[PDB]
Amino acid sequence: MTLRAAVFDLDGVLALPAVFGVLGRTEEALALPRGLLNDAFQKGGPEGATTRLMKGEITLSQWIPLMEENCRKCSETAKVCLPKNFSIKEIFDKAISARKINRPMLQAALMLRKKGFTTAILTNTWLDDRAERDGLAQLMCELKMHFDFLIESCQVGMVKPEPQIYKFLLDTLKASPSEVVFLDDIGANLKPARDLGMVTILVQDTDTALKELEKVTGIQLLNTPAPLPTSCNPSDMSHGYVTVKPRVRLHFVELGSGPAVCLCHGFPESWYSWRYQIPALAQAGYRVLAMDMKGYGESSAPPEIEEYCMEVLCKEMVTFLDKLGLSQAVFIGHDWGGMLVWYMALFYPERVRAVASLNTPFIPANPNMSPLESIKANPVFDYQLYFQEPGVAEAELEQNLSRTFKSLFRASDESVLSMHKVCEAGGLFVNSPEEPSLSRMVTEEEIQFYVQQFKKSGFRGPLNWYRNMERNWKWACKSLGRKILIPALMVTAEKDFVLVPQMSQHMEDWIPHLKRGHIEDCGHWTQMDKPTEVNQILIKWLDSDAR
Amino acid sequence: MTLRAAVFDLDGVLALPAVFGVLGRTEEALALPRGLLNDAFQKGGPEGATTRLMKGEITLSQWIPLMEENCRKCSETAKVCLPKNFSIKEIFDKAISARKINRPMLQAALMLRKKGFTTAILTNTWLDDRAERDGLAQLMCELKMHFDFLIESCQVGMVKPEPQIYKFLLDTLKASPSEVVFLDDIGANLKPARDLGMVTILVQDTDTALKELEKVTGIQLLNTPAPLPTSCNPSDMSHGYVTVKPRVRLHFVELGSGPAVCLCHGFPESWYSWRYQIPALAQAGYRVLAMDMKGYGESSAPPEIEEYCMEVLCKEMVTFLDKLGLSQAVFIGHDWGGMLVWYMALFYPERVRAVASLNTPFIPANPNMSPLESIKANPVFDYQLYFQEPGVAEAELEQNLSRTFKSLFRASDESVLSMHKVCEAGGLFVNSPEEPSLSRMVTEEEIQFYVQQFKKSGFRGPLNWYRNMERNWKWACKSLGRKILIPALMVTAEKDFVLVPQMSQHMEDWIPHLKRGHIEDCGHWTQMDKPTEVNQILIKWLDSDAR
């Protein structure tokens, strides 16, 4: 009163259904004396097998037989048989995976952390060495990244409801009994909290629990809006660096395990533009590698225009796989990244497990008509022309990097950048403000992140991507006999007024088994505009087509 | 005359059995008119489906039906039926995977490169988009890393035996017809080489081919000794960096895909100490992550002694997985790394898919007797005592880093470092030479690599590993109730006179399903002493126990 810390039980609070509640169904299922299992589990109390397990004295595999023993003699003093195929191991395997994250609680945890609460899990638990231990390990990873602390009984050598562990909790939280909330499904584990003077909640059904927590903290926790996906903190990410050419080195951030997925951002962005997708796809069972594309961030940024034609760009990505020892990867790209991704499927399909683009359609080059012509053809591409002259587009873009991104990164219903008559107007920003408002799509902090990156090498490199029209076209014409017959998803964005969804309308001709996806009310900056639906669409497709 | 370049055909030279020789067996198998298939394949010559495919005009999946068509009309003008279940796709899938690397040829390539030949593959081949394309992709990766150039018909848009492609070959090799050798299974593809004035070899059986090559180059290629495994070039590796604590960042090198395998080196080494294992395990189907352990290389090296007790070391590696999104990894370690690896299995088994140590046994702490005592107990551990006093062991080790490694890294039958009476002698090197000879185990270059790394942070950090005896013991005693019941391999080295194989003799008591492995004539520096047998033993065990 008032609080600034929130502590969560695992079994039956952050994870449901609890293992003790499978313990119980088992009895009913097999017509066992009510509580037989539980008798054998709690057996010996503080000096028995189960407690030793929770303190890390012995392992779960070690405990299994001691439990089965106790079940014998619990069922001896009760005078009853034991079923043909009785396995404490099978019962506990089922229970342990049956248990999933309790989403609303986790969200509640997130909320409170977001408003500056120190969050911690206090959980009686064991050193798991069963052959199927990896599942609980996954669970525990997913959770722990969202908390300041994961205090586990077997790691600390103390157990709930033993006071020592609470003194240790307070100790770890650098906070006082009256500044802390502790929720648990077990009254016994609450009484101690109380005696130090802690706010406590007996977590029965989750919704009432949240009601108490809501009240006593004064923050809306129930019924609050759909929260964004998890976003990366750059300094907590694995940063990878692969040189692919004497003086070109590509950097990327990597997270997760399973089939390699290579994310490729558009102009003028950064691996950070995939912050919402990195955790989600990792969590869905993949190994995300989010690029700094050539010209950006910590990836190299050589001046020469040719060093950014699609061909050299693509060979380089091949090399990238080569040097990481990856025979393939599923390639997902957006804006410029999309185009490349398609051209990877067209030229190196043996290396592409699957291809995917957000917004960017696949258009075949017109062998007759040039591309400078084809671009002047549609007025909404005028900005492309303005970018041709080395040095002009950079001067403007670099002059106030904050202004620039603040001006670029806006939701469909927010715009400040018309894209037509830019050459004539004489600037991308000729008639946009010096200090633009902050979009709904990005915290001030997220903008500053991009500003830092772009101080490294400016816009020369990025703008060169637009400066190989004639070359890319010539190269592209080599592929005019081919089709894309590998798994490909196309993902159009209703309100992207430059990569318009109609531009993809014939893509099936060259990509006949193409699968589509589409986002209402979503602008050009797909990833940060609609991160949830992007994750849903992509994860879905990955699972269906990348296995 | 004399040559300095060697060019290899793929199908039927670097890879056997050739696809054309499965083409043939098929005919016999199904009682087809001799050459029916081949007629339909070569059909249309330079203007037919097959050539278009080799030039990259169309894809393999695109070609499949045109081929089946030609087979129809080849078998129409021949007046014959076609089998119930006729599939050009099935025949070519079988053939394409049936084909493996022809080892002796590849070795021959390696040799010649090792003596300063420019090596290249010139191969008629296709853009592979079949659903089972990944296999050929793997093959092609394995090969290409060992060559200066992989010139592929469909990538270049030219084909063997068209002169253009040879002009392009010479062009790419920056060399002249008379400085080049070209081997092929097809006479037609040789005649052109000849006309420019190239040395050529009709590759029939591999051994005669090598005989001609041997002669005309003047280097022994047949019958030469067992060549070492592939070693890493550090600048061609993916370098990863993960901060795990405010001012500690761990670096590692990463290669391959599949189940994560985390390599952990000993004192005083580097991820480079696994150079022979990195490629091999990657090639065997794994994702190697070779560490710079805390205190070494590009990993951080904080001064405090406590920052290197096993516990903080282990939590850090847990964090390491956490931040890379890996729920588990198989941990393999050597020397000090081994010990840690065991203590990871003991404390965090949910995170260890499997454990493995080279030389380092698992010994449980003696709860009664201290560890400083236990160490003075055996004379061959005297060096450990000498390392206790901060600053003394460093001064010696850092004074001439070349001398130091040159003195440390020696095969069993080479030694210059006795390890007993070091305190009394007053130095590790008190009676070893200023300029030691180069071991058989390491090129001058490989030594300099270590010297560079150790200029970063000296030996303070590394020596601290030896300086937490009392702490590690106290921690270790918490685990005295446990056993290791997860897959564990122990790998003893006959002639390691400090981590002696007998020291492991009771390990089965605490690790009951423990699997062993053993290396004759192999010293302390296992990895570089016996890299082949190490790869064989570890890959074997990984495949049996890490799946």
Ligand SMILES: CCC(=O)N1CCC(NC(=O)Nc2ccc(OC(F)(F)F)cc2)CC1
């Ligand atoms: C067929 C069209 C195609 O594949 N293209 C590749 C990707 C496409 N991308 C862009 O132009 N992106 C973009 C356009 C404008 C923009 O804002 C600003 F920079 F202000 F012009 C930011 C990004 C350029 C054309």
Ligand SMILES: CCC(=O)N1CCC(NC(=O)Nc2ccc(OC(F)(F)F)cc2)CC1
């Ligand atoms: C139970 C023994 C054990 O687990 N230990 C962990 C690993 C072991 N390692 C070493 O002492 N390695 C080693 C010893 C000596 C050495 O050469 C030199 F540094 F000169 F002394 C280089 C390396 C130290 C003791």
Ligand SMILES: [Mg+2]
């Ligand atoms: Mg609970």
Ligand SMILES: [Mg+2]
């Ligand atoms: Mg051939």
